[PDB]
C-alpha cells in the first residue's frame, strides 16, 4: 500500500485513548504485584484514569454495620480506598470510581458475581445506599480536596442490563439506584461528574431510556457510559479458559458511533460518552489477551475510538485480577496489558507505541496513525489485523513522508508473533504456570519490542519508508532529524579501528 | 567445524575471569555515574574486586601536609576513600588496591601523568611513604575489620617499568618502593596479600628481577602483577582518539603463560599471578573498546586466561575514566565495559555470557567454552573475532550436545556489530556528542543482547545446534531442560484464539 | 536498686527472641502493605523466620478442583506462595509453615474461623490432605531447592485445642491429621522439621497426649509447638474493640517452663519448644497492642523466653492482618509490631532494642538484661513494666558497669508513654481513623525513640548509670569506646565559635 | 512577649527565602554524595533555583582547546553539565548559572583561587570567551528548550570586586566581561535574564558603576546580583579551621536593604536584586556553620531577607565542597545545609520549618514569623538567637491564637544545642574526622529536630501558646483544628487497657 503523508494536518489525534484504563476490583490494588504493574504502565503510558469494580464491596471493607446499642448502625472504612486512592494519585493517575457491588450487609438480597462474590443485589435501603455514596463522596473530599475530586468521574454500578451484575436485570431499579446515586453525589458537591448505565453492549435502548428517564425526572446525568466487547460467547471452555470468536475493530467502533448517535438524539445531547470497559474478549481466562492478535486489534481502536467517545477503557491495565479465581498460570488469559511479574503484553506495547504519536493528525486509515511532533519529528503506529489463521501474512505498507531535514534517524519497534511476545516464549518453555524467577527474567528480556534503527539520506526532500509489518505486528516508527556532528570529530576514521571502515 | 561436546568433563571452568575489574581512578567512584555503572556490572556480573590507580592520589586526598603548631605533619584524610570503598562492599566487591600515585606533597619531582595529574615520582622520603602506607592499610582494618581486608590485595605502584608511570622507569627504585610498601603492608597484618611489580608489556625481566630483588632481600611477596594488552602504540590520532592496531588475542594468553614460566623458573615458583589490567589497547580513546570486536576479541580472553593467571581484571567497568580528559562524546573510545548512561557496551555483554556458565567444562577450542551447570544444563559462550577489514566473515559452528532430558529451552543472546550495540546506532543518530536523554534510551534498548528462544526435542538425548555468528558476534547459548507442563492444561487448544493454530 | 555488672558472663544470651515472628495470614503478604511492614522489621529486628495462618486457605488459593476428565482433581495453584515466599525470602526471612485452614474444597464440614472464613473442619478425604501436603512441599523444594526448604519449619494446623480452629477440638482427629501431615511431609524429605500440637493454653495436657500419640505410632515430631497469651477472655466489646485483663509475664515464662517439663517428662525429651503465637493478648483489635504497656511486658519475654523454648514467636510483625475484619482506625488494637504506614509501635522498639544486644549476658534481672558485645562494648535494656493503672511510678535503677575503657559514649533510646509512641500521639490529633499523609509522618515522626547521648569518663574503670524509667518505658543503653581524635585537631577551641565556650 | 495574633493578614509571606541556594562548584554535582544531600533538600525544602561556580572551571571541562592542523581550535565538552543539570531538573531544581571561572586554556594568566584552581585572570580573547557564552547558552536551550532555559538566571562571574576572585579586581575589565557576556546572552535569545556584577560585600559602589555602565553603554541587565556575609576577618587560623566573630542579623538584612537603595537610586531603579551567597561565615571550614547558632542566626534572614530582595541564596545547601580542600572531619565548617553522610545540621532544620510556613502573614517581628495557610492551620517558625557566650538564656513567647474550632492539635519541633543537633553528639563520641557508620546512623537519628505535639482545648475562642525557646532554638510550630473522630469510637474506653485510664 502507498500512502502519501502530507506535511500538514488539519486535525488532532487526541489523547482520548489513554484517557482512562481498567483494573480488577479496585481491593486488587492493594497487591504490591498490582502497583509495579501500575507503575510499569503509568510510567511507559499515561493513563490519567482508572477503572475498576469493587470500590464498595467487603475487601475494600467501606460498608459495614456494626452492632452499637442493639441496633446494626453503618460504618465506614476507609483505611484500605485511602491506601488505594493515594497508591493511585501517586502515580498520577485518578479513579474514575465506579459504585459497586453491594456491600453484603446492605445486600436485598444473595446474588453474587465472580469467585470474590461481589453482592449484585439493590440495597435493602436506598437511603442507607444514598448515605454510602455521601459518605464516600464525601471521604474523597476530605483526604484529596474538592479540586482533585472534582476532576474524577463517577459511574453509577456496572452492567446493569445483565442479570449477573444485577438482580433481574431490572431497568427500572436501576434508573431508581442511578437517581439516588447521582443526587447523592451533586448534593455533594454540583460540579462532580456522576453517570451511567454503564450497560454492556446488547442493550442500547437503556442509554436512550437512562436519558430519558434523566430528563422526565430532572437527573443529573454528566456522561453516559458504556462497555464494549466483540467476543461472542465461548465455544469451548477447558477448566481454566474461555475461548470466544471475535468481531473485527470495526464492529466496535460502530458500537461507540451508535452510542454517540444515541446520545446526540437524546434530551441531553451534549453529553461525554465514556467506554468504561473494553476489550476483544469479556472473560478473564481467554488466552486472546495474551496473544500479539489483541495487540494488534487493539491499535486500530485506539486509533479511531476517540473520533466517537471522549474515553474508551481497556479491561485492564494488569493481570492481577481474580473475578475468575487467581489466575492459574502466568499467561492465562486476563485482561491485563501486564502479565504477572510485570511481563508486558503485546497490547501493552501497542498502548506503548500510541503514546510516542504526536498531536498533529497527518493520515490515519484503518491500518496505520501517522503523526507529526512539535520538535517536527514524525511518529507512525501501524498494525497488521489478521484474525485468519495462517503462517506469513506479511503486509508490506510503503511510506512516503515529507521531509526537509536533509538527515533522519528511523528509530522502529516491532511487536508481533516472534517479538514483544512472551506467550511465544512461555509456550517454549512448557507453558509453566509458575515459572522460576529465571524464566520469568527470560520472558521479560523477550516481551521487549524488537528495535531496528537506521540513518537515512532524504532524497528530494522526500523519505520512502518500506515497512514490513508481520502477522499481527503493530509497529511504531519514529523519523527523527538528524544533527550530524560526525564534521566535529575531525580526523574521525572508523577505518583506523580493527576489522572496521 | 563439527564438536561434539562430551557429556561429561574432568575439567572445571574457574571464575578466574570475573574475580576482579578494573576502574578508572578511585576518586571517580565518587561519581553517581560509576556507582550506578559498578550497580549494573554487580548485578549483571558478580566480580570480587576492583582495581584502579589513584588510591593515594590527591583528588581523593588521602595524603597531606598540614602545618600544625609549627610542623609540616602528615594529615590522612580518608573522608572519600571511606566512602568510595563502603560504596564498593555494598556492591559485594572488594579493593584490589593500587598504592598509587605520588600525593604531590610526599613528591620527590613535578612529572605528573595524565589529565588528573597523579604523580610519579618517587616519595621525597620513604619514611613518611611508609607511614602513609601503615596509615591507610591500617585506617582500613579499623574501619572493616582484619577479616575483611585481609581477603583484600594490594599491588605497588603501577607500571613502573613505563617512564610515564614511574620517573625514569628506575627498575631499582621501584624495587625500593616495592620492599618499603611490602614491609609496611605486612607490619600491619603479616597475611595481607602484597605483590608487584604491576609493570606493562614489553619488559618482562622486570617479573624475574623483581622476585630475585625479593629472594635476595627477602621481601614479602604473595602475587605478581602484571598489565596486558595487544595494541602497538598509536599509529593515527584526532583530537580526540588514539587509534591502535591490535596483536591477535593469542599474544595476550601467550604473554599471560610466559610470565607464568617466569614465575615458575623464579625463587617463589608458586606465586599466583594477577594480570591488574588488560584490554585490547591501553588507551581511553580507542574507539575499539566501543566496538562488537572489542567483546568477540576479549572472550577468548575470558575463556583461558584462567589456565595461566589467577586473576586478569578487564580495564575497565566503566567509561567513568579521565586519564585522557572527560569523555569528549558518547562513545569515545573508553576503556569501560560501560558506557556513560549506563549503555552496555558489547565487551559488557561479553563477561555477562560468560557469567551464565557453569563449573563443567564439557569442551573448549578457541572459538567456544561449553559447560554443564549443576541443575544440567548447557551454556556455551560463541565468539568470531575478525580482526580484518570487511563485511561478511561468518562462522557456522556446529554443536552436538547430549542429554537424556527430552525437551530443550534454548536461549540464545547475541551481540554483534547490529546487535547489542548503541556504538553503530550512535553513529546513525550522527555521532551525538552529548545525547538527549531520548537518544541515551534508544541507545539503551540498542545496546541489550538480541534474545533468540526456541524449544527442540532431543532425538537420541542429542540436541544438535547449527549456530551461526556473524562478524564479531559473541554469543550466549543455554539449553535448560524444558520439564513441560502443557499436559497439565486439559483442554489447552491454541487452534481456538483468533488467528492461532 | 543496686546492680553491680559482672565484668565477665558465665551465660550467652542467645537469638531465640529473634528466632521466628508472627503474621497474619499469607494472603495478606501479597499486600505492598504488608511487605513495606516487613523490610522495615527485617532491616532494625532480624527475624529469620515467620509463622502465619492460612497457607492451605483460599485466598491464597492452593487447593481447587478443577473437573477433570470428568472427575474432581486437585490443582494446586502457587501463584500466590510463590510471590508471597519469593518475597519472604527477598528479605531474609524463612516460613515457619503452618499447614491451615482447611482449603473450602477440602473441607468437610461449613465451620470457619475469622472475617476471611478459614475452614476449620477436617479434610473430607485425609489421602488429598496428604496429597495437597506432599504437593506444597514438594513445590516449595522444587522452587526453592532442597537445602533451603530443609531450613524451614513445618507446624501442623493451629490450636486444634480451640472449638474455633478446629471442629470440636477434636484431639484424636487433630493427632490424624498430624500424622497424616508429619508423615507427608516425611515422605518428601527427612530432614523437614515438623511438629506440633501448635495448641493454644489452656490444656498442655494435649502435649503430653501428642506426644505419646507420636511415640506410640511412631509419629515422626521434630519439635513442639504450641501458643502463649496471657490475656483472659474480653470483659468489654465495642464494635470494633475486645477489651481484656492481662496476667503479668511471669505468667507467660510459666508457661513456657510448664511446657519444656512437659516435653523432659515425654517419650521425646530432647525435642524443640516454638512458642509460635505470643503476645499479651490474643485478641487482633486489643489496643494494648498499640500502647507502651505493650512494649514493656514482651520485653521481658524478650529477656527470658530463650531460657525455656527454642523459639517464640511474636504474634504480629504487621497490623496487616483481618482476622478481625480490616483495620477500623490507624490505632485498632491489631497484634502488630508495625501499625499501618510503617509506624513503628512501642513493642516494635523492644525488639530494636534487643537486636541490639551482645552474646555475652553479663546481667539479668526481671526488669533488664545487660550484654558485652564483642568490640568491648555494653547494650542493656531495662523495662519498667508497670500493669497498674495511674501515673507517676517510675523506677530507678543503678547500673555499676565495667569498661575496659576511660571514655565512653552513652546512647540511651526510649520508648514509653511520651516518646516512640504514636498511640498518645494519635489520641491527640482526634483519634483520626483514616489520617491524612501529614498527620501519619507526624505519627512516624512521633513513633521513633527519644535519644540521648553523652560522653563520659569512667572513674576507676567503672560507669555508673543513674537510669530513670518512666511507666512502661522500655530503654536502650549503649557505652561505647570513645577512641577521642580530638587532640588531633590542633587549635581546635570551640570557644572561638560565635556563643560557644 | 506577648503576641495577640490577627486571624488574618493583609500581606503575604513571599517564598523569595527559598528561591535559590548555593552550592559547591558544579563538578561536585557529579558526586553520589551531593546529589543524596540535594535530594534531601528538595524533599523538604523546596529550592526553584541553585546557584554556584566552576560552570566553566575545568573539572566540569566545557572549554578545551584541541590541536586541529598546527591551531588550537576550542571545543566545547557537554558531557559533564548535561548530566549536572539533569540531575539538577529531576531534582526540580534549576541552575541560577554562573559565568566562571576561566577555563585554563582561555585565561590569560595564572591566577588561580581555591583548592581546585579555578582561574580567576581575564580571557585571552574575549571574542573567545564570548563564544564559549554562545555556546554553552545555545547548548542550554538546545538541550531544555528555551522556554525552560528563559526561567533560569545568569551571573556573570564571581566576586570581581575580589583580587582572589578576578585579576587585579580590575572594576573596568569586569565592565568588559559582563558586557561580553550579557550581549553574548541576549544574542542567544534576548529575554534570557543576565544579571551581575556578583560582589561580595565592603565595595557597594561597585553596583552604582555597574549600573551606570549598562544604562551608558546600552548593556542588557535584568538583575543585579551581590553577596552578602556577616562574618569579620578571622581571628585564629588552624590548619583546618577558621574561627571568625559575626556582625548580627541585621547587618546583613541592612546589606540587603542598602544595595536595594542603591539599585532605586539608579538608572534602572526596578531591577531584581538576587542574594547570589548569604550564610553567616565566609569560609567553608568555619565551624559556625554546623552549629545550632547558625540556624538561629539565618531564620531571621528567612524571615525578613524577602522584604528587600528577590531572593537571597544560603551558601551552601551542603557540605560537598572542596573549596579548602576535602572535608577533614565530618563536622568541618563547611557552609552545607547538609552535613556529609546526609546528615542534616540546625541551619537546615531552619529553611525545613521556614517551608512549613503559610503565605499569609499574620505577624512578624524579628524573632518570629507567624503565618496562616489555606486550611486555615497557623504555622510559626520562632527563633531565639544568641550570639553571647553562655548557658541557659531561654525565651518565652507567648502568641495568642484566635480559634473558633472548639480544639487544636499542636505540633511543635525544636533544633537548639540539644535536639537536631548532630555536632553536639559528634563531639561526644570523641570528633570522629572518620566516623563509622553506626557513627553516622546515631548522628543522623540525633539530628531530627524533637517533636512535640499537644491537643489543645480553646478557651474564649482562644488558644493561649507558651513557647519557650532555649539558646539558639529554631523551632516550628503548627496549631490545626481537630475534627475529634473519639464519638464514632461507641463505648471506647482506654480504661479498659491494663495501665491506661
Ligand atoms: O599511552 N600510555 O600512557 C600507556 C602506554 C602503555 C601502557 N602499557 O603498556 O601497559 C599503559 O599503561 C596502563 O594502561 C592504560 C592506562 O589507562 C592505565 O592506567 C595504565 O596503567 C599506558
Ligand atoms: O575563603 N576565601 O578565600 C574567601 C574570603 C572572602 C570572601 N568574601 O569576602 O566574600 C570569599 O568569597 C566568596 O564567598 C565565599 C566563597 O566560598 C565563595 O566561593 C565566594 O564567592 C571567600
Redesign the interface.
Known amino acids: 500500500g502507498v500512502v502519501n503523508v502530507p506535511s500538514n494536518g488539519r486535525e488532532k489525534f487526541k489523547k482520548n485513548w489513554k484517557f482512562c484504563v481498567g483494573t480488577g476490583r479496585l481491593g486488587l490494588a492493594?497487591?504490591?504485584?498490582?502497583?509495579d504493574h501500575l507503575k510499569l504502565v503509568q510510567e511507559k503510558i499515561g493513563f490519567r484514569y482508572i477503572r475498576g469494580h469493587g470500590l464498595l464491596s467487603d475487601d475494600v471493607?467501606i460498608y459495614?454495620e456494626?452492632?452499637?446499642d442493639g441496633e446494626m448502625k453503618p460504618?465506614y472504612?476507609?483505611?484500605?480506598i485511602?491506601?488505594i486512592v493515594?497508591?493511585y494519585l501517586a502515580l498520577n493517575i485518578r479513579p474514575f470510581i465506579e459504585f459497586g457491588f453491594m456491600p453484603k450487609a446492605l445486600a436485598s438480597g444473595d446474588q453474587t458475581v465472580f469467585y470474590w462474590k461481589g453482592n449484585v443485589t439493590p440495597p435493602k435501603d436506598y437511603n442507607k445506599w444514598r448515605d454510602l455514596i455521601v459518605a464516600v463522596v464525601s471521604?474523597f473530599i476530605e483526604?484529596y480536596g474538592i479540586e482533585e475530586v472534582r476532576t474524577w468521574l463517577f459511574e453509577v454500578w456496572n452492567a446493569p442490563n445483565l442479570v449477573n451484575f444485577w438482580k433481574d436485570a431490572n431497568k427500572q431499579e436501576y434508573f431508581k439506584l442511578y437517581e439516588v446515586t447521582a443526587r447523592a453525589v451533586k448534593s455533594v458537591d454540583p460540579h462532580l461528574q456522576v453517570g451511567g448505565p454503564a450497560i454492556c453492549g446488547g442493550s442500547d435502548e437503556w442509554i436512550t431510556d437512562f436519558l430519558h428517564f434523566c430528563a422526565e425526572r430532572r437527573v443529573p446525568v454528566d456522561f453516559v457510559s458504556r462497555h464494549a466487547y466483540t467476543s461472542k460467547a465461548p465455544?469451548?471452555?477447558?477448566?481454566?479458559?474461555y475461548?470466544q470468536?471475535?468481531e473485527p475493530p470495526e464492529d466496535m467502533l460502530e458500537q461507540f458511533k451508535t452510542v454517540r448517535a444515541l446520545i446526540r438524539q437524546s434530551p441531553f445531547p451534549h453529553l461525554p460518552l465514556h467506554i468504561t470497559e473494553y476489550n476483544?474478549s469479556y472473560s478473564p481466562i481467554?488466552?486472546?489477551h495474551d496473544?500479539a492478535?489483541n495487540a494488534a486489534?487493539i491499535a486500530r481502536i485506539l486509533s479511531e475510538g476517540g473520533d466517537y467517545v471522549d474515553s474508551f477503557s481497556y479491561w485492564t491495565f494488569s493481570d492481577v485480577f481474580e473475578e475468575m479465581?487467581?489466575?492459574?498460570?502466568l499467561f492465562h488469559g486476563g485482561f491485563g496489558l501486564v502479565a504477572?511479574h510485570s511481563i508486558p503484553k503485546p497490547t501493552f506495547h501497542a498502548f506503548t507505541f500510541f503514546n510516542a504519536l504526536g498531536d498533529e493528525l497527518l493520515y490515519r486509515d484503518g491500518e496505520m496513525i501517522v503523526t507529526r511532533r512539535k520538535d517536527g519529528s514524525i511518529a507512525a503506529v501501524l498494525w497488521n489485523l489478521?484474525?485468519?489463521?495462517?503462517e506469513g501474512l506479511t503486509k508490506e505498507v510503503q511510506l512516503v513522508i515529507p521531509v526537509s531535514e536533509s538527515?533522519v534517524?528511523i528509530?522502529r519497534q516491532i511487536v508481533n508473533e516472534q517479538y514483544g511476545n512472551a506467550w511465544r516464549?512461555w509456550?517454549?518453555?512448557?507453558?509453566?504456570?509458575?515459572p522460576?524467577?529465571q524464566a520469568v527474567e527470560?520472558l521479560r528480556?523477550?516481551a521487549?519490542p524488537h528495535?531496528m534503527?537506521?540513518?537515512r539520506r532524504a532524497t528530494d526532500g522526500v523519505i520512502h519508508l518500506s515497512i514490513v509489518l508481520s502477522?499481527?505486528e503493530v509497529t511504531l516508527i519514529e523519523i527523527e532529524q538528524?544533527?550530524?556532528?560526525?564534521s566535529?570529530?575531525?580526523?574521525?576514521?572508523?577505518?583506523?579501528?580493527?576489522?572496521?571502515?
Chains 1, 2, 3, 4 share one sequence.
Open positions: 492493594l497487591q504490591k504485584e498490582y502497583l471493607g459495614r456494626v452492632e452499637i460504618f472504612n476507609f483505611t484500605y485511602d491506601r493515594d497508591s471521604h483526604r465455544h469451548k471452555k477447558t477448566f481454566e479458559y475461548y470468536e471475535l476483544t481467554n488466552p486472546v496473544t492478535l486489534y479465581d487467581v489466575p492459574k498460570a504477572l489478521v484474525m485468519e489463521k495462517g538527515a534517524f528509530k516464549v509456550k517454549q518453555m512448557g507453558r509453566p504456570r509458575f522460576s524467577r527470560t528480556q523477550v521487549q528495535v534503527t537506521e540513518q502477522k499481527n538528524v544533527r550530524d556532528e560526525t566535529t570529530y575531525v580526523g574521525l576514521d572508523d577505518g583506523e579501528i580493527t576489522s572496521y571502515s
